[PDB]
Design an enzyme around this catalytic site. Structure first.
Site, PDB file in Angstrom:
ATOM      1  N   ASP A 110       0.808  -1.237   0.000  1.00 24.05           N
ATOM      2  CA  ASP A 110       0.000   0.000   0.000  1.00 24.05           C
ATOM      3  C   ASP A 110       0.833   1.275   0.000  1.00 24.05           C
ATOM      4  OD1 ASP A 110      -2.141  -1.890   0.503  1.00 24.05           O
ATOM      5  OD2 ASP A 110      -1.332  -1.862   2.562  1.00 24.05           O
ATOM      6  N   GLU A 120     -11.096   0.271  -1.560  1.00 24.71           N
ATOM      7  CA  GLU A 120     -10.240   0.860  -0.527  1.00 24.71           C
ATOM      8  C   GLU A 120      -9.067   1.508  -1.183  1.00 24.71           C
ATOM      9  OE1 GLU A 120      -9.271  -2.636   1.700  1.00 24.71           O
ATOM     10  OE2 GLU A 120      -7.802  -3.320   0.246  1.00 24.71           O
TER      11      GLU A 120
HETATM   12 CA   LIG Z   1      -3.261   4.838   0.585  1.00 23.00          CA
END
Ligand SMILES: [Ca+2]
Ligand SMILES: [Ca+2]
Length: 801
Positions: A11, A260
């Site tokens: 991420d 997300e």
């Molecule tokens: Ca992020």
């Protein structure tokens, strides 16, 4: 030419400081690079104290950890500090009243909904970062409540909300935040993770965040302090999207659906806010894929190329919504293509950030990805992006290698392409290429028909089966062939992306010659397994097979191993390779090995009221409690298949000795009496460490008995057969240098190749009934027989009786 140095940062949130590019990701990992190609990690993960980013992690972020992410529910045993975002905030008022600091906004999580976002600051990008506050919370409840393995009270009074009501920033609790049973209403409202801090056109500061559940929300932020300016009042945006006094304004997702890793970028050149979000699940089978919307306002409405809203209308498949900019793909290196390996592809690429350079306009998608055939192993990738005619940035097909847009000649465009279309759907499937050519009369022929044009220096317009795709031609490093090649990337108004990579010009003869020199069946002098015989080579080259002797090996590579003790047996496979009127022939000399009897190396019968090895060359077993690494369970010996079997109540099993298996030529047999079936629950297991393991699974992820390896790579030894309870069943599997077989009651139910080698030159851990994650086996297992070598079909149809 181009050099890359890889890092595993999950991420990645990129940020440029000075001349250096930095990425910050989950698990307190970070790295830096000056060129976006070679990365150097400077963090030490969850090491604490002297944690690189936070110091004494536990005390610095205690404020956040009171609510989730330290040794609690899904974080039991460790920490969960996820998906940060980092920026220099020139307006931040430091606690000595000086202005300016680097902010890190981070997430902590304990379940799929109980999470919070907090931030910390530093004088320096590499830290130390000192905690400021925790500002958004999810998964709270109407009354006192706890989660399994959690002592943390989830009542809303235990969040920041009471203080916010006291400060006049909220009027009170919103009833809608709760289901009728008082549970957190994650249908409508978010999981508080994955923050993205961005600036709008005017220099105002916003935070978007969220992951599944109610979706993605955005809040304005006070530049001076780092805190949200909560709306204070429920409502609805002009076009009708939910506004909430606390959680802010809903800009994407909804109704539990995936989504997300939000990243929003205001682009002054087009005057759009570009919203990136990742659909699907992160795991190799998850179908993680990046999506793209835009708005004229930071707060939305965000829509895709088709004008559809990012905010879901209801509990529906989110597939149609969002330009799908990258999914699972492989530019497959078929027989005859230059290079080695299977070619370049990604699995579950996603959770991206974006760097847009103010001066030059260059733009870069940054994200982590997994790969075919390596399971959950992940690395950071960076693809350049390029504004197309319609105000959509388009992703390049290859990782960034110094390229830039050029003046491109029609001459250098015309030719054969491999082409991948990412569609809208997403799953574990991996998209592979087709073959087309872009002809000098601006037509397109091959596996698809249509038309194309270059416009200006390098804009592309590809029209295929009545769909037009707008994009660019750009040159690109293909790491398979090791050349710079011409490529194209282009998006249609459906928001579907196609990618193109020009193949080397080649006659039909040169192709056949290439397919012929590249055709290899590996070591065929020690064959114990079916041979896969390719029926196709590159660019639709056709390959047919004949066998000298079908009793040794068939035309499709099916082998017939002779009897134990017999002579190895020989035959010849001949490949005929055609494309057009070019043709070639190649022969391969096969030797199929006889079966060899596995010899028993250890035997846990449990027949002498203990976990002794009868063969008397391994220690006895010990008892565990409910995991391979914990203690204090109970082994009742009770009446079983031969002598006494081992019983396991449901809350332990047997730690077998280290090194039990220590080869890539081994076999395991046992008898199983289950009472209940639980998914992933092992019998025999399995492991070098918690990332490299084998498990004989009575009910696995597909609902059936399987032999399972994971997590790097994954192996699905699927028998497609379901096992009964209160009842004995015989299970055996063998492993023989990648060759794997699994037997249900004597019959062979799975056979495959490339089984991982988990135990050669390791001293691994082994057990019955338990692992590191899943419910223990409940029932009895009898007569655990380990072997060196692969049991013969004969040895096995005898153990079964
Ligand atoms: Ca992020
Ligand atoms: Ca026994």
């Amino acid at each position: 030419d181009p050099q890359f140095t890889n890092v595993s940062v999950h991420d990645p949130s990129i940020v440029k400081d000075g001349d250096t590019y930095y990425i910050f990701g989950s698990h307190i990992e970070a790295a830096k690079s000056k060129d976006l190609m070679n990365w150097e990690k400077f963090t030490n993960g969850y090491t604490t104290p002297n944690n690189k980013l936070y110091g004494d992690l536990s005390k610095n972020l205690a404020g956040s950890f009171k609510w989730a992410g330290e040794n609690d529910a899904d974080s039991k045993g460790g920490f969960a500090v996820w998906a940060p975002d980092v920026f220099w905030n020139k307006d931040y008022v430091n606690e000595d009243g000086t202005k300016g600091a680097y902010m890190i906004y981070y997430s902590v999580s304990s379940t799929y909904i109980r999470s919070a976002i907090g931030y910390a600051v530093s004088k320096h990008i590499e830290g130390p970062y000192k905690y400021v506050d925790t500002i958004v919370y999810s998964g709270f409840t109407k009354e006192e409540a706890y989660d399994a393995n959690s002592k943390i009270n989830k009542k809303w009074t235990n969040t920041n909300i009471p203080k916010l009501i006291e400060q006049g920033k909220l009027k009170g609790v919103r009833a809608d935040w709760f289901h009728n049973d008082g549970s957190y209403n994650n249908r409508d409202f978010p999981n508080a993770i994955d923050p993205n801090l961005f600036y709008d056109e005017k220099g105002n500061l916003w935070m978007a965040y969220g992951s599944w559940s109610g979706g993605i929300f955005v809040l304005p932020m006070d530049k001076t302090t780092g805190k949200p300016i909560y709306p204070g009042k429920d409502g609805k945006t002009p076009d009708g999207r939910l506004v909430d006094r606390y959680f802010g304004i809903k800009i994407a997702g909804g109704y539990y659906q995936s989504g997300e890793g939000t990243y929003i970028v205001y682009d002054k050149n087009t005057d759009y806010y570009y919203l990136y979000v990742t659909y699907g699940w992160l795991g190799a089978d998850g179908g993680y894929n990046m999506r793209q919307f835009r708005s004229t306002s930071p707060t939305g409405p965000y829509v895709d190329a088709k004008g559809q809203s990012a905010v879901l209308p209801g509990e529906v498949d989110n597939s149609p919504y969002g330009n799908k900019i990258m999914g699972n793909f492989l530019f497959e290196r078929k027989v005859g293509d230059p290079g080695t390996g299977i070619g370049v592809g990604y699995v579950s690429p996603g959770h991206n950030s974006v760097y847009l350079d103010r001066k030059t306009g260059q733009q870069f998608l940054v994200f982590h990805t997994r790969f075919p055939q390596s399971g959950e192993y992940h690395e950071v990738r960076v693809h350049q992006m390029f504004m197309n005619k319609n105000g959509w940035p388009v992703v390049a097909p290859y990782r960034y290698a110094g390229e830039k847009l050029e003046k491109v000649n029609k001459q250098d465009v015309v030719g054969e392409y491999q082409l991948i279309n990412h569609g809208k759907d997403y799953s574990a499937d991996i998209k592979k290429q087709i073959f087309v050519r872009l002809n000098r009369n601006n037509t397109i022929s091959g596996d698809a028909t249509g038309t194309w044009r270059k416009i200006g220096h390098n804009q592309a317009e590809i029209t295929i089966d009545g769909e037009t795709y707008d994009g660019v031609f750009v040159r690109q490093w293909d790491p398979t062939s090791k050349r710079y090649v011409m490529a194209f990337t282009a998006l249609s108004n459906e928001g579907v992306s196609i990618w193109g990579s020009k193949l080397a010009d080649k006659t039909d003869e040169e192709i056949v010659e290439d397919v012929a020199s590249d055709l290899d069946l590996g070591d065929t002098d020690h064959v114990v397994s079916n041979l896969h015989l390719p029926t196709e080579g590159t660019r639709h080259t056709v390959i047919s097979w004949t066998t000298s002797d079908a009793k040794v090996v068939s035309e499709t590579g099916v082998v017939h191993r002779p009897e134990v003790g017999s002579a190895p047996v020989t035959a010849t496979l001949t490949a005929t390779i055609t494309k057009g009127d070019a043709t070639a022939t190649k022969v391969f000399h096969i030797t199929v090995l006889p079966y060899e009897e596995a010899k028993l190396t250890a035997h846990y019968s449990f027949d002498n009221n203990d976990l002794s090895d009868s063969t008397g060359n391994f220690g006895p077993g010990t008892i565990t409690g409910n995991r391979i690494d914990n203690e204090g369970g109970t082994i009742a010996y009770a009446d079983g298949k031969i002598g006494k079997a081992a019983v396991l109540n449901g809350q332990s099993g047997i730690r077998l000795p280290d090194g039990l298996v220590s080869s890539n030529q081994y076999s395991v047999s046992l008898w199983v009496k289950p009472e209940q079936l639980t998914t992933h629950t092992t019998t025999f297991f399995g492991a070098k460490d918690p990332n490299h393991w084998i498990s004989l699974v009575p009910q696995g992820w597909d609902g059936n008995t399987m032999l399972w390896s994971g997590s790097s790579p994954w192996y699905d030894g699927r028998t497609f057969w379901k096992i009964p309870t209160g009842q004995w069943t015989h299970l055996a599997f063998s492993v023989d240098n990648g060759a794997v077989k699994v037997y249900i009651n004597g019959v062979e139910k799975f056979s495959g190749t490339n089984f991982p080698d988990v135990f050669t030159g390791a001293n691994a851990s082994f057990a019955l009934g338990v692992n590191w994650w899943d419910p223990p086996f409940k029932g009895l297992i009898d007569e655990l027989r380990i072997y060196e070598g692969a049991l013969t079909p004969s040895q096995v149809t005898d153990l079964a009786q």
